[PDB]
Amino acid sequence: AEALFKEIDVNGDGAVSYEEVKAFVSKKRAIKNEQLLQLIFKSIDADGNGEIDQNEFAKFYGSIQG
Amino acid sequence: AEALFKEIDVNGDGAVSYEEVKAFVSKKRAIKNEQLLQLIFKSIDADGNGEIDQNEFAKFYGSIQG
């Protein structure tokens, strides 16, 4: 894997160190968490204005079905 | 959900933003972790004085059965 090795190899010296594997696994996890939250947000925000009003919020709930 | 929408809507402007959903999911998780730990503590602290002595600690263990 090429851009992947370069992405992990942050100081660009050809070697992936322990710190770098650790910083990588760490940010990979953070990114995955954001994407899921955003996707959940976007799905509740039915009109896409970027905020959830009490109505959008109301549909979503109901022993959650919405 | 009413007090719930108000609880998430922290700056009180009627709209639940992404930051607020994120701060909410975050503190909800923190609270759930505390409650479980405390419940586990309270259960080991057999006399409720608020500290676990070596005896209370001893029963609890035993390839944990106590």
Add this chain to the structure above:
Amino acid sequence: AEALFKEIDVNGDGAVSYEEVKAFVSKKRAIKNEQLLQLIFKSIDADGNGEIDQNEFAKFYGSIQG
């Protein structure tokens, strides 16, 4: 459990407090995470020089089989 109670009982007063149980569960988790990451690192670092070169990295990948 003896060294274990002493390990958790950080200020050495004979009683394991809530803070101490919480600090303990916390560092236990951190240690377990490190050990797994290191073991995964060590396994990719096929020659043990302490860094993963593109070759060691390449074997490891392949719809990961290596």
